Structure 1
Amino acid sequence: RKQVSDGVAHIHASFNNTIVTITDRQGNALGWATAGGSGFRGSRKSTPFAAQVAAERCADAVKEYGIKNLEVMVKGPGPGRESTIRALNAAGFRITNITDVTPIPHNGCRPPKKRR
């Protein structure tokens, strides 16, 4: 709860899951989001619909937490990528900032080779 105004939701968007716990810039973490824990296994793991139903079930009972607008920091491609946080804006909960931090290196350490 804690009854605050806004917050900093950092979204680690993997190729399979838009993992986001309702977090803050100070570490205050309450409300999870999972593309597998919201059901949707099989082909439905990397599907955008898995994330969106999980994102509404991420902002579940957060009105009591006081939080309305949340700083989205989306990291990676993400299964939804344009609807996960958008339906939250379509439901009304606007975003203070969408900082899509793509972690681009200068091609340092050698990357793997899956899908031979």
Structure 2
Amino acid sequence: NVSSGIIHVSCSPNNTIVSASDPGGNVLCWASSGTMGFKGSRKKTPYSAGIAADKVAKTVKEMGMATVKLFVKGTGRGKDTAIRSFANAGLSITEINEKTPIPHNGCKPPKRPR
């Protein structure tokens, strides 16, 4: 709803989630690469992530976000296609933010993929 909100993009080893929020910590709309139904290796494709992020980009373009804050999160095949999906949908890139946390073994992650 704000003139410049955020659309946070998370790239989990399977899926690409795009969630559009106001800066006051209020997500007003959402999409994901599981919404259109692709599962596994297909929803990790750049096309799936781009189509998932284009939906939130357009709907925030109409509902009040002319531009957006470009928060990139994670690494993968859909980490940056979301950014261009936002850009082409009217959300010009005011700035980019790679706010990925850098932990220091504050946990013990479970068994590592093989």
TM-score when scaled to structure 1? 0.79
- 1:102 is displaced (CA, Å) by 2.2
Structure 2 equivalent of residue 6 of structure 1: 4
Within the candidate set 64, 82, 85, 2:80 is matched to 82
Say which structure is richer in helix.
Answer: 2
Structure 1 equivalent of residue 110 of structure 2: 112
My pick for the range that moved more, 26-35 or 106-115, is: 106-115
Structure 2: gaps of 5 or more residues = none
Number of equivalenced pairs: 114
1:20 alignment partner AA: V
Structure 1: gaps of 5 or more residues = none
Three-state SS of the structure 2 residue aligned to 1:41 is coil
Say which structure is richer in strand.
Answer: 2
Q: Deviations over 1:78-105 (max 9, x none)?
A: 4312222113323442122221122211
| Rg comparison, structure with higher value | 1
- 1:74 is displaced (CA, Å) by 2.1
Q: Write out the 4+ residue segments of structure 1 that deviate beyond 4 Å after TM superposition.
A: none
Identity of aligned residues (%): 50
Within the candidate set 49, 58, 61, 1:51 is matched to 49
Give the whole-Å Cα distance in 2 for the aligned partners of 1:30 and 1:19. 14
